[PDB]
Amino acid sequence: QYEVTDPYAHSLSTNSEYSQVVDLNDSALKPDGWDNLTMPHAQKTKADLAKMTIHESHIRDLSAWDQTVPAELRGKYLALTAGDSNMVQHLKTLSASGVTHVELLPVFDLATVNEFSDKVADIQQPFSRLCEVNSAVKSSEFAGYCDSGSTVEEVLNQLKQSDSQDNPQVQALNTLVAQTDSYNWGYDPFHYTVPEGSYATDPEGTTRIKEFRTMIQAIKQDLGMNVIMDVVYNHTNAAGPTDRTSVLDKIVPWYYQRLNETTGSVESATCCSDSAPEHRMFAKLIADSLAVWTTDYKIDGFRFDLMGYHPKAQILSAWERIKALNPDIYFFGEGWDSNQSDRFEIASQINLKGTGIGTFSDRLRDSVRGGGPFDSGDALRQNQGIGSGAGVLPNELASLSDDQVRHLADLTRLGMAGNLADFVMIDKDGAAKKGSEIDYNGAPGGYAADPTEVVNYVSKHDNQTLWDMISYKASQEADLATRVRMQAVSLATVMLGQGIAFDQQGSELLRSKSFTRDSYDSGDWFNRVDYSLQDNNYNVGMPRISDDGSNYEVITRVKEMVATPGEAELKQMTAFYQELTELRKSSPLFTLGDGSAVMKRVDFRNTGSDQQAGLLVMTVDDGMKAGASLDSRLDGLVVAINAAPESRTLNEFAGETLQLSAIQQTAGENSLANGVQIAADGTVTLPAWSVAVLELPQGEAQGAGLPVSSYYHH
Amino acid sequence: DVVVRLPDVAVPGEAVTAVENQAVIHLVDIAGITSSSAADYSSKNLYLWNNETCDALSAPVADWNDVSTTPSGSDKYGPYWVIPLNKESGCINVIVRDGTDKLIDSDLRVAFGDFTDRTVSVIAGNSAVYDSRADAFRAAFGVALAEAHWVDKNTLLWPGGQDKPIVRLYYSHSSKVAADGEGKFTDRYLKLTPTTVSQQVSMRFPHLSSYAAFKLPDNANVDELLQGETVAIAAAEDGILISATQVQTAGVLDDAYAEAAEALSYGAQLADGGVTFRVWAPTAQQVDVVVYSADKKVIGSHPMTRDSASGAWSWQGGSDLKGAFYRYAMTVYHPQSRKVE
Amino acid sequence: DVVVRLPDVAVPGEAVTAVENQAVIHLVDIAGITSSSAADYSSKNLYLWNNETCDALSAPVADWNDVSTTPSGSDKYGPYWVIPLNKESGCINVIVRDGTDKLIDSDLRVAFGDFTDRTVSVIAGNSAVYDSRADAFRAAFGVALAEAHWVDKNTLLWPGGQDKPIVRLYYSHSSKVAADGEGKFTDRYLKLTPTTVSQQVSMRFPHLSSYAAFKLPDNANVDELLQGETVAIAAAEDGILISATQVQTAGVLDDAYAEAAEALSYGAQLADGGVTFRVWAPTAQQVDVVVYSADKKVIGSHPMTRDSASGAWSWQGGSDLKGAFYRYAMTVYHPQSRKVE
Ligand SMILES: [Ca+2]
Ligand SMILES: [Ca+2]
Ligand SMILES: [Ca+2]
Ligand SMILES: [Ca+2]
């Protein structure tokens, strides 16, 4: 006998203690002209979808450190309205250069942050506040600071001075702060269909609904970008008849949760309390929830956390259902193997071929970044990537073979061509192979029917930041300048590829987490994004012992290898990032959308057994043999990525009349193509760590362009 | 019945890079790579010679009977010759031979200002020069050039199919004839049989009289074949592709339709009783008259009637059409783009 | 119905070589290699400890709750631990775990005088130590050991098949159950279903009462199954082999034949009315009495009559046989040699 909140609650009291009766259609809950708000970017066709350029952001990560954001709006939905802030104006410029979508890390009702202001303390506030809220701090190695008139932020910078692998004092205090902070990613669902209240100015009542909507209007109208909501239907924060956060398991016990076949214990494969999307009423809950975010919140797309735990049939059912409210809605998620195939056909990368549901591709990710997740110790240095200089510029610990390096080129190329199962290419050995025939750790590399089913990335909230990975993987020889270009080169593989471009907020500012792997509860300190551009937050302390202690020896070996970026380097990287996105939006040839278009137009050079390492050369046809003239200005495209310390030569386009992109020519000395030579005789000289978009201008009519080998079909 | 398939061989990577004051020519041996057996490249030689045009050679043999210029080495893909040079600038005259017989029809002229690397590749009877062994191999094992000639309803002329065990006419109405993910030629085909050039044909096409003649089956539906793509394929006894080429069909178009077509009137023939629109398009899949206003807005779109004897398309409309603008909306396979335009 | 097949994975090659005053133990992860997905080896730890017998360890954690001894690295094949040593001589005590739970049933004792290289490999629940990851992998993906127990007509006890999606009883009359050139288990089988150990069984075999019970199909021809080889197979939902083991059949032999067999007389029973030869051989494919002279020359070879209820074979001859020498000529599958002897 207990009182439970509604699983279908649409409004709540502070800390979700009581559900509230609400009418989301009320003008009172709408910012002015909400009813006439439209999606700034189209999502109707595969070609519309392929244009998608995602920036995965977090509410605190955006405004927690930005001083130009009024104090009371920092770490709030309303922060996006601070038109005159470093953060808002930064997003405004990124949007203008080609970032199309904003992905929001958990903004539904999370369980893991106390919504009562006075039961919480952040680093911005005095150390005394920390001790008042946190009992543990009063009985720890920092108890002495409760007496000091200094803030937690202050004390943290003081601890840096003597922070080392043998004395990890910065992270020790942070661990304690993290229990009473306002910082969590939020992958802990309390209520699926209510916004989080801690990101609101007042969490008591409906205030959150108008504020969230206000943020949506700002993103779409004032920043001119679509919205993607990160969703977590795979688990609930808790189950059982006692947990405060158990809602679903208190109402229909043993129904909503996935239980072990023998013991009836709630399974925890996802972490936490495994939900059962395979059961009819929970599948209904998921669909009804998405309906609300779709029409009442005007969300453009959804990213499903651990989507492999859901039955493919459920995802498709929800999708058809949501399409009736918004026909141009996009669904994508993490389609990794969940090990639920004994129970149902899982919503995996493989199983979703041709469904329309997109999945994150780990193939290009791992090839460009180097190694894979779960890498620990010296493997974090040993497993270099195309972008860390695997093969071309090895580090002292590296032992990667020529074939091993060539195979990463094979996986990267396949990814750049939208990771398709049927795309034919010339492998590391000179064999003609379908994408599905190229291995990826025992799995078929290519798996998709259309590039719109693939999301390429080299950085995300989870795992090491791109910069941190380069810091672990780059040769002692790679100076700050080459490592900045290494970041850009890594990003070019995503930005200039047929698949959907996704990236972590901050990659344009060489974002660092000072080697933190799982920054979910590493607070404002480690997850800091400086929008005033003074630094990338690198070397700000040893990361969490619990999860990164096993990597301290590797961190010390690499940490001091190169200088920390400053205003100049961050500005250099932003310029490069804006270049790449501008390029992506510069031709319909970059975003073909249809798998058949990719196969009829996309091909690669510098392929085979004899290939030059680090040189990625992609050709896109707009010539007569491809079909219709897609770009009225071009006949074809060339993407050249020289991820090598030696400058390279391109004699492939013998006598072809090419020109560097106007986008890159305008950039000049600040271009990634700075120094690219195009000889009258069609020979291209590519400088080290450079990216060039060579374009084939169209004459007075569609000529023959860059026709594909047409070596195989199907 | 044998399936035509690609050879299970990786794409080649030069094997030899041309160094200072010396060029390298690769012979991409098709017969050599289709064979799991080793080849004797002794018979292979280059007749090299200096002239007013291409004089960059160093010590070229004068004697035409001199077969001494044998390969400077070999591998699976074929032989190669490391040719010594006088100057790294200019060009050289190469005649690729197997004894005292030209392998490449045309006299090659290797312009070093066209191939910066001086590492070049050639295929027998190809006339073309490639910068790579790969570029050559791809060309060799692809539908390439338009070597075959459908000269009459029954006859297909092709020197490439001469003495070959498998000679076929592959076709596809709405797609290109190609090799699948397994490297097989699955598209519909017709079996060709060796024949002799007709007296009537020799008259019409004296420039092809020497070309190898092939008889098409009697069941062949000439009309529907000309509706789309046709490709001439030559293969081994085992079905490994030797050659795949596009087909030149003007000869058959004259032989199948011209007699009837010649007896008709063309254009937008406005006479008493209205206006007859007639266009000859014997290969077109569809033809429509599109009628436009003075503002060039569509006033009518009329699908035309095809006369099978002639391949002419017609459409009759009122005398009201006097002064109307029009164009024919075509649906036709173009061999240059290999698509149904 | 799913085909049981081998995993498409090359045989491993150690990845890490043990150096001076340090040993290396490889965990060959079966679940890890059957999966095209990456694995989290955090939960994996070794409880290492020094005792009067195996004291060569350097600084072993005392705390049993200490899961801190996590892998020193990993790859596709599984994790590994680089264990620091005190002396390169002697032995070490390793308890391989996934949390505070033993992965290998027996406490391992790694004798460095048995494995010269100090690079050793182990599989979960295997108890055995391999010199190579290869030797382990081969053992893992093979018919290995005799883990399964056919205890009665209907019941097969096997801990290895516990919670596994595919549990089968493969059989072959005249050959060994194996994987073909494609790595598939093509031999005839029976589908096993999870059941509980019978009260009657628990009495008979208390030492197996904890073992996972499986019900055989009702159509199962027990008699003909015991004529040759049987192998218990456990596979993934997709059919990738987890385990293949030989079957111990004494239990079923007692349950199927002993009641009848117990009521008969054995030997060369010479009585009034002649001599009855009887041998119990319920698995034998064939039994013959071979009768010998005093010089040990064959005087007669008589194929015996099998009683199906008992599995006993008999043959009746004259009282003339008093004093004759004899042996039984057997045709029988021996599980030690895996052949029909
Ligand atoms: Ca909350
Ligand atoms: Ca927290
Ligand atoms: Ca399960
Ligand atoms: Ca064009």
XYZ file of N, CA, C and O and ligand atoms in Angstrom, chain A residues 12 15-16 108-113 115 190 195-198 208, ligand 1:
65
model
N 5.054 17.914 -13.092
C 5.336 17.444 -11.719
C 5.630 18.581 -10.719
O 5.843 19.723 -11.129
N 11.276 17.833 -7.398
C 11.874 16.506 -7.219
C 10.919 15.325 -7.547
O 11.101 14.190 -7.067
N 9.905 15.622 -8.414
C 8.929 14.690 -8.971
C 8.137 13.909 -7.917
O 7.703 12.782 -8.167
N 14.521 14.949 -20.258
C 13.285 14.399 -19.710
C 13.477 14.386 -18.156
O 14.528 14.803 -17.656
N 12.515 13.873 -17.397
C 12.714 13.872 -15.953
C 13.734 12.851 -15.395
O 13.416 11.672 -15.211
N 14.970 13.337 -15.120
C 16.026 12.500 -14.543
C 15.846 12.424 -13.070
O 15.218 13.299 -12.475
N 16.348 11.351 -12.486
C 16.246 11.051 -11.071
C 17.448 11.542 -10.257
O 17.288 11.935 -9.100
N 18.635 11.538 -10.882
C 19.969 11.787 -10.316
C 20.438 13.224 -9.974
O 21.647 13.448 -9.801
N 19.511 14.176 -9.830
C 19.852 15.527 -9.373
C 18.710 15.972 -8.460
O 17.544 15.908 -8.866
N 16.232 18.322 -7.061
C 15.581 19.528 -7.597
C 15.347 20.586 -6.539
O 14.992 21.718 -6.872
N 13.198 8.985 -14.436
C 12.223 9.022 -13.326
C 10.819 9.022 -13.995
O 10.026 8.086 -13.788
N 9.687 17.349 -18.751
C 11.057 17.882 -18.798
C 11.713 17.794 -17.426
O 11.005 17.746 -16.413
N 13.059 17.806 -17.384
C 13.797 17.852 -16.127
C 13.543 19.240 -15.444
O 13.541 20.276 -16.114
N 13.314 19.236 -14.138
C 13.038 20.464 -13.399
C 14.243 21.256 -12.946
O 14.118 22.453 -12.695
N 15.413 20.603 -12.809
C 16.626 21.289 -12.344
C 17.187 22.229 -13.401
O 17.889 23.168 -13.046
N 8.636 24.670 -15.866
C 9.556 23.941 -16.713
C 9.080 23.793 -18.209
O 9.885 24.009 -19.140
Ca 14.113 15.289 -11.698
